[PDB]
Design a protein around this ligand. Sequence first.
Ligand SMILES: Nc1ncnc2c1ncn2[C@@H]1O[C@H](COP(=O)(O)OP(=O)(O)O)[C@@H](O)[C@H]1O
Length: 337
Amino acid sequence: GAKVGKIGVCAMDAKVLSKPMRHILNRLIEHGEFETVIFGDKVILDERIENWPTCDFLISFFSSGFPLDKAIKYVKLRKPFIINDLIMQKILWDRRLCLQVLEAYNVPTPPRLEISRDGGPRANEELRAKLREHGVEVKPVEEPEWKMVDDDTLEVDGKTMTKPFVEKPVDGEDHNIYIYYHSKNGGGGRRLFRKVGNKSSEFDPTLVHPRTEGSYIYEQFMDTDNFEDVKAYTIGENFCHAETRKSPVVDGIVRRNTHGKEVRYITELSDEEKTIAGKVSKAFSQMICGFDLLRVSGKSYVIDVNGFSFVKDNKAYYDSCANILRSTFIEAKKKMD
Ligand SMILES: Nc1ncnc2c1ncn2[C@@H]1O[C@H](COP(=O)(O)OP(=O)(O)O)[C@@H](O)[C@H]1O
């Protein structure tokens, strides 16, 4: 087809060189409709933003090492069309802000309490203004009054939650999540952790009281269908792919194939789950977005939003992603031209 324009990919090379990124970009360039503009780690890290290459349609997202604030300044200067808002990617780092945004868009989440000891989330004025556009005010908060009423019951400022419950650090990149079981289901708890992406856990019969340093979310432990979690992958508000995986929260067991990769099964989404997926993409202004959902006997709850995430090794996903990006960019060009 006729040339539509230039797709810039402003992300770390580790992500730009992924199989999905290469195969999706190849689909977009192979009929002559788009040209790719490569940034590269040396330019991103060491060159001034006024010297970064420019494009019409920009794909850009954070991963470890990416200078997000610098990329935000580039977008402010050059104003390409974007599909994943960069400023909103900052909120993925604070579970409290993510939950505030989900709530503001009527996305169901598990019951929770919060014990913040850090004064609340931090945000500069640029992030505050972006959040206001998403229905969220960033508020200072003091440490609440709290206690364990008994071994099974947490109280925070007069509201209670009964075990089992899940204690998550407010840092969205800290996966040291603790599960606290009810005494009548054997009590104790389980510490989940990650070792260079490798998930593990350990049962401790004595884990009973919350951590006393740090800031945490306490979510009701949901009894999920088949003890699984759903990994969902959006491409805008009207496309979502989903897979189940076994959760370790009950028994510590993760299922892996012989190559060490977590076993996953493609699953069909209900209409309600498709609606939730569209809401997550919209709420975070992330066209391409991964999130985790829990299925509990006919109800679904979002527990995490991970931001830019492709499905790997699925030719239909690659085709659909190229087709949807193509249509999106054609429309974006029409609006400008
Ligand atoms: N409220 C909850 N109820 C039940 N399971 C939960 C809840 N919150 C988190 N989980 C589970 O705890 C595990 C650890 O969470 P996390 O580290 O965020 O997983 P992931 O690496 O998939 O983001 C996951 O299996 C997730 O499904």
